[PDB]
Amino acid sequence: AFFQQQQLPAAMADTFLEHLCLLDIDSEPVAARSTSIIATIGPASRSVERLKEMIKAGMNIARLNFSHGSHEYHAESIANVREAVESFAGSPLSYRPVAIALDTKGPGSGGLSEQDVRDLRFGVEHGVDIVFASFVRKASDVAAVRAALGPEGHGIKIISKIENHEGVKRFDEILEVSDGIMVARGDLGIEIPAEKVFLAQKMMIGRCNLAGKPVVCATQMLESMITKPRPTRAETSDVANAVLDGADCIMLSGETAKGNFPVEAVKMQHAIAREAEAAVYHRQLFEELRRAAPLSRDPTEVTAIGAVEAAFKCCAAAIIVLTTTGRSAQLLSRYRPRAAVIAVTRSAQAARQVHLCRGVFPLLYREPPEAIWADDVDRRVQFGIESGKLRGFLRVGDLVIVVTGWRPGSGYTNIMRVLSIS
Amino acid sequence: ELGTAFFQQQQLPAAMADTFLEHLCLLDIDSEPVAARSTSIIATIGPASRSVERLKEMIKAGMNIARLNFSHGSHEYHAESIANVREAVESFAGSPLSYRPVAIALDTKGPGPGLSEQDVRDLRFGVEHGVDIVFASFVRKASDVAAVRAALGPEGHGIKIISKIENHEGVKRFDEILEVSDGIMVARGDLGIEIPAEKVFLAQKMMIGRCNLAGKPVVCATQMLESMITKPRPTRAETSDVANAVLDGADCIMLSGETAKGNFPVEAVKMQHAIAREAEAAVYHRQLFEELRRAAPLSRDPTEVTAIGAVEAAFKCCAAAIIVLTTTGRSAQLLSRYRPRAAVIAVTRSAQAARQVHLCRGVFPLLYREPPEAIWADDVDRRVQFGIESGKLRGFLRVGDLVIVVTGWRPGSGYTNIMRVLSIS
Amino acid sequence: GTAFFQQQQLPAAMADTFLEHLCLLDIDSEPVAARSTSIIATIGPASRSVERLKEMIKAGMNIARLNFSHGSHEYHAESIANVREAVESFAGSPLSYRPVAIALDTKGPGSGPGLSEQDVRDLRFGVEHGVDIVFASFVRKASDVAAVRAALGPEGHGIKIISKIENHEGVKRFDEILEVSDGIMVARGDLGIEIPAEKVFLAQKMMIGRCNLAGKPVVCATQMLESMITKPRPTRAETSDVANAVLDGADCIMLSGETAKGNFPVEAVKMQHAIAREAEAAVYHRQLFEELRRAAPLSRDPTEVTAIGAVEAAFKCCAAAIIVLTTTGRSAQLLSRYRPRAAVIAVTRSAQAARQVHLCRGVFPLLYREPPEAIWADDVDRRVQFGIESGKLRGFLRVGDLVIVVTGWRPGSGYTNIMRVLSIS
Amino acid sequence: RADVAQLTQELGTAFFQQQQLPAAMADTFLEHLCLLDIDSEPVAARSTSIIATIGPASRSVERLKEMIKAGMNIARLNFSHGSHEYHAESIANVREAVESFAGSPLSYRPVAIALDTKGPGSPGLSEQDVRDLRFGVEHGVDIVFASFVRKASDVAAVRAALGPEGHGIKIISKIENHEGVKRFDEILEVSDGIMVARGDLGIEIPAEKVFLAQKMMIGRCNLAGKPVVCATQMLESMITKPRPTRAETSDVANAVLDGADCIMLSGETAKGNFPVEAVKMQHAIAREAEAAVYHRQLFEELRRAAPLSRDPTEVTAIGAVEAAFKCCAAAIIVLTTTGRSAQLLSRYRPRAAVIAVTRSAQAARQVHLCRGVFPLLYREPPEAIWADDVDRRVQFGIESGKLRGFLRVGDLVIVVTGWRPGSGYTNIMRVLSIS
Ligand SMILES: O=C(O)C[C@@](O)(CC(=O)N1CCN(S(=O)(=O)c2cc3c(c(O)c2O)C(=O)c2ccccc2C3=O)CC1)C(=O)O
Ligand SMILES: O=C(O)C[C@@](O)(CC(=O)N1CCN(S(=O)(=O)c2cc3c(c(O)c2O)C(=O)c2ccccc2C3=O)CC1)C(=O)O
Ligand SMILES: O=C(O)C[C@@](O)(CC(=O)N1CCN(S(=O)(=O)c2cc3c(c(O)c2O)C(=O)c2ccccc2C3=O)CC1)C(=O)O
Ligand SMILES: O=P(O)(O)OC[C@H]1O[C@](O)(COP(=O)(O)O)[C@@H](O)[C@@H]1O
Ligand SMILES: O=P(O)(O)OC[C@H]1O[C@](O)(COP(=O)(O)O)[C@@H](O)[C@@H]1O
Ligand SMILES: O=P(O)(O)OC[C@H]1O[C@](O)(COP(=O)(O)O)[C@@H](O)[C@@H]1O
Ligand SMILES: O=P(O)(O)OC[C@H]1O[C@](O)(COP(=O)(O)O)[C@@H](O)[C@@H]1O
Ligand SMILES: O=C([O-])C(=O)[O-]
Ligand SMILES: O=C([O-])C(=O)[O-]
Ligand SMILES: O=C([O-])C(=O)[O-]
Ligand SMILES: O=C([O-])C(=O)[O-]
Ligand SMILES: [K+]
Ligand SMILES: [K+]
Ligand SMILES: [K+]
Ligand SMILES: [K+]
Ligand SMILES: [Mg+2]
Ligand SMILES: [Mg+2]
Ligand SMILES: [Mg+2]
Ligand SMILES: [Mg+2]
């Protein structure tokens, strides 16, 4: 029965063609949904009660579009998101972190606009986790956004939105200085011929997967759900294909900001992403990611590939990783393991931001610290196991891969262990 | 000899990549498509696209197959639409650069247990009106196809039956249905109501993959450009859906309400044409050909053996086209199953085969009407040169190009066994 | 039949990985195909008699090597005459006649910077006596090959120059030497003294791989069955060395003292024949063909394009043979570079080309002696029928087999462009 | 180039020109062959073990010290010749020559002692074999090369004749005839490893078919993760000549490229005029051939073919080998009691040396059967705290590694350990930087 679920017959195929031939509508997804859902918060999804339903439906990142509303309006939305999120902190083995992303208005006819400088300052003051920088055309646009975030906003992730021909042509220099990319198909579909957007999307997703950096697929994914309770056949296909292309995140704009079915749109993206993640041909994907990833003498990078290889060898239910900044979880995520990457962190901000990396399930550690650092690490690993059991990721008898470091502090990941559950 | 400019067009840098991941990384929005659009467009003919003048614009925009949905209208209404399609098609017989065969497909209302009374009458209407294809609704098992086949009376055994898979049973019994059908339609409208909407993409990818492996045509249908029923431009999900159907391996893409009743029928055809051309150049032929080769069983049929040799030869020299002589369309279909990048120019005397080969990706039919030469080898050479001169006229070929020419050793269908490499003079 | 698929290591041939291919090799799976790696036998006192040379031709000797490091011009002229007498003794039965090449192996440069004056005289003797191949000793750079070519003069333009790589400089300048040579000999005797003995296998494997990639003949030479100079059976290392030279991709394997001066010249030829047949069936064609195709550049030469199409067609149907008409041997060489499992039966009127194509693995030359038919197409057909009749007599073909036939569109060399699938009747 | 650019800037272009690294990075086997370079020098320690037959030409303690220095890892005693007294004296001389270097862990070299049986002659285990096997147990031999194994019951008979005191002895079944080849799978299943005995095999089956049997058995042993020895006439002419033939060097190189864990010398060391030179020649060829292995395809094929495993030692071994390839690790240091954790690393054919730290003198000798395993015998008494004892053993491996030239400051090493004492609990992989 285990080998009939999660498209495992299609996963064992010797060619991509045979893998497609073996895809089965009766093979149910079992693994947790790996692709994060970004929901735009607006009039239809602002209330605390509505936000609780959206968190339960699967929203991982709340996007505030600074092209609309005001600072007062967006601060109220942020407060409602935080109130809805913290309303679940009662059960420590089930709490779900939710990131807050600020999407800028953009430069318009002009460097960094004066409104963007003020909105970026608002983001820093309100503790946003991510900035989706509109109309990034070159590396210097990213540097300007980074400067406007100042010294207090050093830890904020900058996801550059590629929205025009110049951004596509200068993609490599933009990706080099950004934390990640957003394929902003709305403007891209007006800036370049509409029939070429899929080439830009597939190229950028492939290059971000190669670089090990997050990539978001955005705009009109479930557009008809703004007024209708069910999406079109093209819309479900678009969501599934963004996941199969390799997108770390999928986004909802008007579907959640102003539409009549915000919760249903999140549930639809969740249901499609789960099905599409099981349909990924890991045999080819892992081999290609492995071959293309450069040789490295960084112990975190070396441990990450060893851990992902070990996870595939035993059909590991999860890879539990201890991380301060999210980096060790990101390096595991770049190899696209089928095993969930359960990231146990004390940083509330890192827990929110690792939603940008596919297959990373953040757990915020809130238990008393042990006197012995070796015993503290073991408590954090046991926390990951207990949360995993409660959430359905793990069961007694499962094998897990545990990734830890040799000394406290960020940058010292170097250990992989094979653990049997209970 | 060819030039660096040649190797920058039609996603040739992405085509040379050693992995699928590197192929995606090399896709370039500035690399322009050069080859003719190979995925056929099926347009549903209804009130918005019924007039002879509108049909001429749809043919110019790229419509290859006219679909008549017998779930709506009447026999009289559909006969008038068929007459208008044939009048619009024959209005271009005076210009070789514009004349294009257009197939006529009848889409049945559907089943009750067996074949419905109305379907028996509509299938009889199809035979009497000389339709080329039947899109059989709600095919659930092999016996449903046999019933449709039996209904195509004594005169319609040459009509292609494309079985529409619209529910759980059709998906589960897919292999037995494909075995007795000429092809498959992934009918996503009903499929998305019969099975969970989030599972339709799995059924689509599986059926397209299995049809590609069997060498049989597969149509992707329903809501591909849905918003274009009321809007002049499609959504980002819609253009992606059309491109991904082509990348999945679909031989045909379809328009339903977009052309039957919408405000932008011609624009919807133009949009499918533009997207399919871009998507066909983005196909990773290096892996596709290797996998089609490895999965296809060994064959002692000369047509099949010649077809793989011709496709291998075409890739080796970047041949502008593979010109094939065919009476039934079968030799062109066997070339199409290996997904050559070279256009398959099929020269035929059969007007029906010319219309029907639109079901096979990359087949460009040329109907030949010259009287037969007394010496067969001369009649063969005349048809080969007709394909080259039509190719030159349409932009497929230029002097100095290499073409692969597929023929047989004796007249009559079923004897293809020769592949030749010709330099265009 | 199931019996067909158990022979010639076909279970190992279908394996999905090289490791599984090795695991499926079966000592009970008998070789069926004709031996495709040519055997070069050095002529000396143990192999000079006309009667002994007839036994060596029957055992499998394809090329007779004359070693100009020993004996006078008078001795080599008698060797040539004896070889020709033994070869022409079988000319009375044209369907079974086996051409045998005569290769001249030069003394070399010695302490000098390039072409010696003895080499100049010996090379002129070769042209005057009609040698087919020169094995140029101690080639260190491209200018050494040009000097050999100049010493052959205007009458020796058709002689093949196989450069012997025997020292460090030759290995380091390999690419420039291969570019101007017709092929290479891995001369392991001197190579094993010029470079560390434990490195010779790396030089052998590298040069064989680069010659396979270039589509040029490579010979593996020296001490392959050394112990058979005095013993009737070889050592375990010797049989392994011959099998591994074939698995590496060598077109030819050589015997030196084993046939020139040893006690078992005929047995040494029979042993190389038996090993080579076993090793050729053990070649993992699935990976080899895929790698040869991926590495071979795109080509606009119709002979090369037809050759890859013909090899692809032959693999698709398990063709017993590829029958090719050739004037210079070039069309057969271009088929051979893709390493088909099907035997390449080359029909030619050129006695020299028939001898020289032995340098290419899997090419079986047939010398056609009939004068040309008045109708060119009939002359082509008669030559194809001669290939079929010789093939049936020799065991290559049977009624019911499929063969691929490669011909051209006009008389004269350079116009191969047609591939055809023929059923043997 | 992009997959090696940062590491090329760090380690240098000179590093990437040695040990056939340009051929190792090739995308196809054909391009890998085209990139093999006679100027690319081997750097890694020789990983294929050399089995030398001990006889009249190689029996003296002084000669044996030269053979150990030349590279002999396993001393074979052929019970088809000599007597119990003769073989006991050879064993004592091997042990005296081996223990003469026991003054330091950076000079000590464990050497296994293998007993090769006479065989059954004309069906069951012969009476002479029962006595010779009893001699082996009494003299503490590490391995038995069982002659003419034809079926699984032949290896059970050898195991029974070894008795309750010889349970730890490795049984390597010699495949010497058609029946042994045909019943190979059942024989490998119950044996510790295999020997392709080409001498008898070349007389029992057609000589032109021996290479098929050799390549098939080596491939199946590689797939099973069990040791395979290539034997007989590898350097035959070196019995009387100081240099081998071109076919002989090719045969040794091709046995290593085929996947043999061990290569053997018979008359070359037992009775020949150049025993030390024959060992040196096998050492030099094996080092060149190991660097020429196309690891990219080999590792991918070993992974595709190996079934999924829920054994933590197996899971840790593949993770450690993957990690070693990612950073061009100089070594994988593994703690082992029986040799099993080192054997599971060896089955994935890492380019990194597997330095196996063990307290078992017998396991240190027996791991020579596994390609790429370098045994270090740890002699210190156990620390009070087990975690400290583990750390001391890992540091012993690092210090021996530095002293012997396997490791340098700045190198990355992979360290493989377990969660509790005792055999069977390996489950940890660590990446350590050498300081
Ligand atoms: O800036 C650009 O480059 C272009 C553009 O303005 C395009 C545009 O006009 N759009 C229409 C509005 N939608 S929306 O329905 O998703 C949407 C609507 C609203 C808000 C959004 O954040 C939002 O994203 C509010 O914040 C919001 C706040 C207060 C009251 C109402 C709302 C609200 O109606 C997005 C697309 C854009 O922004 O891309
Ligand atoms: O049969 C089924 O199982 C379900 C269904 O009936 C579903 C359905 O009701 N649909 C609404 C109509 N569209 S349509 O806009 O594409 C479309 C509309 C019309 C016609 C169509 O052929 C047609 O396909 C006429 O022939 C037509 C003829 C005469 C007057 C008007 C029209 C016309 O308005 C298709 C979807 C179907 O058929 O799938
Ligand atoms: O029974 C078999 O399986 C067949 C066979 O006996 C074949 C055979 O006869 N051989 C000849 C002898 N060689 S040998 O030169 O390597 C060699 C020679 C001698 C010894 C060997 O162990 C030995 O291996 C002594 O122990 C030895 C001890 C005391 C005095 C002299 C010697 C000595 O001359 C091996 C091959 C075999 O064993 O395969
Ligand atoms: O992923 P990051 O940011 O590098 O953090 C990983 C770090 O987490 C640890 O596992 C635990 O560190 P802390 O005790 O500081 O939480 C370190 O050993 C390791 O260096
Ligand atoms: O694809 P089909 O229907 O088998 O037709 C292929 C046939 O066409 C030809 O090339 C030409 O035949 P005709 O002259 O009868 O048209 C035949 O030699 C070959 O058998
Ligand atoms: O292999 P080559 O030397 O190019 O010769 C091939 C030539 O042989 C032919 O098949 C027959 O030519 P001939 O009639 O002159 O022998 C030509 O059509 C073709 O060009
Ligand atoms: O390879 P083996 O035979 O399983 O031995 C590995 C064992 O060695 C250890 O690393 C150390 O064990 P000891 O302390 O008993 O020597 C164990 O944790 C592990 O189980
Ligand atoms: O801003 C966006 O999200 C877009 O344009 O797609
Ligand atoms: O009938 C159709 O076309 C459908 O259901 O999608
Ligand atoms: O010249 C040769 O043949 C040699 O050196 O091997
Ligand atoms: O017994 C042996 O070692 C042999 O036959 O090779
Ligand atoms: K915005
Ligand atoms: K219908
Ligand atoms: K010579
Ligand atoms: K013995
Ligand atoms: Mg935008
Ligand atoms: Mg329907
Ligand atoms: Mg020489
Ligand atoms: Mg023996």
PDB file of C-alpha atoms in Angstrom, chain C residues 293-386:
ATOM      1  CA  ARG C 293      25.516   9.989 -31.741  1.00  0.00           C
ATOM      2  CA  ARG C 294      25.708  12.628 -28.958  1.00  0.00           C
ATOM      3  CA  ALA C 295      29.403  13.283 -29.637  1.00  0.00           C
ATOM      4  CA  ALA C 296      29.242  13.290 -33.432  1.00  0.00           C
ATOM      5  CA  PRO C 297      28.692  16.816 -34.752  1.00  0.00           C
ATOM      6  CA  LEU C 298      25.798  17.790 -37.059  1.00  0.00           C
ATOM      7  CA  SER C 299      26.592  17.076 -40.702  1.00  0.00           C
ATOM      8  CA  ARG C 300      25.454  18.398 -44.033  1.00  0.00           C
ATOM      9  CA  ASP C 301      27.184  15.576 -45.976  1.00  0.00           C
ATOM     10  CA  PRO C 302      24.522  13.277 -47.468  1.00  0.00           C
ATOM     11  CA  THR C 303      26.707  10.155 -47.112  1.00  0.00           C
ATOM     12  CA  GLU C 304      27.125  10.807 -43.361  1.00  0.00           C
ATOM     13  CA  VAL C 305      23.399  11.657 -42.942  1.00  0.00           C
ATOM     14  CA  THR C 306      22.373   8.465 -44.833  1.00  0.00           C
ATOM     15  CA  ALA C 307      24.852   6.389 -42.734  1.00  0.00           C
ATOM     16  CA  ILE C 308      23.344   7.417 -39.342  1.00  0.00           C
ATOM     17  CA  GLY C 309      19.810   6.874 -40.715  1.00  0.00           C
ATOM     18  CA  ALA C 310      20.819   3.404 -41.979  1.00  0.00           C
ATOM     19  CA  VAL C 311      22.436   2.429 -38.630  1.00  0.00           C
ATOM     20  CA  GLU C 312      19.349   3.644 -36.719  1.00  0.00           C
ATOM     21  CA  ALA C 313      17.117   1.654 -39.124  1.00  0.00           C
ATOM     22  CA  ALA C 314      19.335  -1.479 -38.753  1.00  0.00           C
ATOM     23  CA  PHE C 315      19.076  -1.406 -34.926  1.00  0.00           C
ATOM     24  CA  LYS C 316      15.262  -0.872 -35.081  1.00  0.00           C
ATOM     25  CA  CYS C 317      14.624  -4.110 -37.007  1.00  0.00           C
ATOM     26  CA  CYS C 318      17.638  -6.238 -35.910  1.00  0.00           C
ATOM     27  CA  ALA C 319      18.828  -6.160 -39.533  1.00  0.00           C
ATOM     28  CA  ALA C 320      21.187  -9.073 -40.395  1.00  0.00           C
ATOM     29  CA  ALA C 321      23.261  -6.722 -42.615  1.00  0.00           C
ATOM     30  CA  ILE C 322      23.668  -3.233 -44.137  1.00  0.00           C
ATOM     31  CA  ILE C 323      24.625  -3.761 -47.818  1.00  0.00           C
ATOM     32  CA  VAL C 324      26.476  -0.718 -49.147  1.00  0.00           C
ATOM     33  CA  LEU C 325      27.813   0.042 -52.630  1.00  0.00           C
ATOM     34  CA  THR C 326      31.144   1.877 -52.406  1.00  0.00           C
ATOM     35  CA  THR C 327      33.893   3.017 -54.812  1.00  0.00           C
ATOM     36  CA  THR C 328      36.543   4.275 -52.353  1.00  0.00           C
ATOM     37  CA  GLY C 329      35.239   2.539 -49.175  1.00  0.00           C
ATOM     38  CA  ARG C 330      34.063   5.877 -47.681  1.00  0.00           C
ATOM     39  CA  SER C 331      30.295   5.055 -47.472  1.00  0.00           C
ATOM     40  CA  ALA C 332      31.203   1.797 -45.631  1.00  0.00           C
ATOM     41  CA  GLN C 333      33.536   3.668 -43.261  1.00  0.00           C
ATOM     42  CA  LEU C 334      30.776   6.174 -42.384  1.00  0.00           C
ATOM     43  CA  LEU C 335      28.418   3.274 -41.522  1.00  0.00           C
ATOM     44  CA  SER C 336      31.183   1.550 -39.437  1.00  0.00           C
ATOM     45  CA  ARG C 337      31.822   4.686 -37.309  1.00  0.00           C
ATOM     46  CA  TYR C 338      28.327   4.251 -35.716  1.00  0.00           C
ATOM     47  CA  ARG C 339      29.212   0.687 -34.658  1.00  0.00           C
ATOM     48  CA  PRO C 340      26.141  -1.140 -35.968  1.00  0.00           C
ATOM     49  CA  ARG C 341      25.583  -4.688 -34.702  1.00  0.00           C
ATOM     50  CA  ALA C 342      24.487  -5.496 -38.350  1.00  0.00           C
ATOM     51  CA  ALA C 343      27.412  -6.570 -40.583  1.00  0.00           C
ATOM     52  CA  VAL C 344      28.306  -3.895 -43.196  1.00  0.00           C
ATOM     53  CA  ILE C 345      28.644  -5.824 -46.455  1.00  0.00           C
ATOM     54  CA  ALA C 346      30.535  -3.487 -48.817  1.00  0.00           C
ATOM     55  CA  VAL C 347      30.227  -4.239 -52.532  1.00  0.00           C
ATOM     56  CA  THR C 348      32.908  -2.651 -54.676  1.00  0.00           C
ATOM     57  CA  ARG C 349      34.653  -2.992 -58.025  1.00  0.00           C
ATOM     58  CA  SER C 350      37.870  -1.430 -56.653  1.00  0.00           C
ATOM     59  CA  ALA C 351      40.203  -4.243 -55.587  1.00  0.00           C
ATOM     60  CA  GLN C 352      42.203  -1.685 -53.550  1.00  0.00           C
ATOM     61  CA  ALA C 353      39.126  -0.326 -51.721  1.00  0.00           C
ATOM     62  CA  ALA C 354      38.014  -3.911 -50.988  1.00  0.00           C
ATOM     63  CA  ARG C 355      41.380  -4.534 -49.302  1.00  0.00           C
ATOM     64  CA  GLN C 356      41.511  -1.190 -47.431  1.00  0.00           C
ATOM     65  CA  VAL C 357      38.000  -1.326 -45.859  1.00  0.00           C
ATOM     66  CA  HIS C 358      39.319  -4.153 -43.600  1.00  0.00           C
ATOM     67  CA  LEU C 359      40.684  -1.236 -41.494  1.00  0.00           C
ATOM     68  CA  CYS C 360      37.046  -0.403 -40.476  1.00  0.00           C
ATOM     69  CA  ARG C 361      35.324  -2.569 -37.916  1.00  0.00           C
ATOM     70  CA  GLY C 362      32.396  -4.576 -39.175  1.00  0.00           C
ATOM     71  CA  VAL C 363      33.040  -3.980 -42.865  1.00  0.00           C
ATOM     72  CA  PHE C 364      32.992  -7.179 -44.975  1.00  0.00           C
ATOM     73  CA  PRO C 365      34.311  -6.348 -48.471  1.00  0.00           C
ATOM     74  CA  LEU C 366      33.032  -8.122 -51.555  1.00  0.00           C
ATOM     75  CA  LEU C 367      34.918  -7.620 -54.782  1.00  0.00           C
ATOM     76  CA  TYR C 368      32.465  -7.413 -57.710  1.00  0.00           C
ATOM     77  CA  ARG C 369      34.084  -8.478 -60.988  1.00  0.00           C
ATOM     78  CA  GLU C 370      31.294  -8.203 -63.589  1.00  0.00           C
ATOM     79  CA  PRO C 371      31.503  -5.424 -66.196  1.00  0.00           C
ATOM     80  CA  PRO C 372      28.901  -2.644 -65.895  1.00  0.00           C
ATOM     81  CA  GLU C 373      25.329  -3.179 -67.164  1.00  0.00           C
ATOM     82  CA  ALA C 374      24.119  -0.701 -69.818  1.00  0.00           C
ATOM     83  CA  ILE C 375      21.337   0.488 -67.483  1.00  0.00           C
ATOM     84  CA  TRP C 376      22.896   1.979 -64.314  1.00  0.00           C
ATOM     85  CA  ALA C 377      19.933   1.070 -62.091  1.00  0.00           C
ATOM     86  CA  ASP C 378      20.312  -2.590 -63.220  1.00  0.00           C
ATOM     87  CA  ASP C 379      24.049  -2.519 -62.464  1.00  0.00           C
ATOM     88  CA  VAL C 380      23.255  -1.219 -58.936  1.00  0.00           C
ATOM     89  CA  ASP C 381      20.625  -3.985 -58.447  1.00  0.00           C
ATOM     90  CA  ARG C 382      23.052  -6.682 -59.687  1.00  0.00           C
ATOM     91  CA  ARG C 383      25.643  -5.535 -57.147  1.00  0.00           C
ATOM     92  CA  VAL C 384      23.047  -5.548 -54.314  1.00  0.00           C
ATOM     93  CA  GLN C 385      22.017  -9.104 -55.390  1.00  0.00           C
ATOM     94  CA  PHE C 386      25.682 -10.147 -55.385  1.00  0.00           C
TER      95      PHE C 386
END
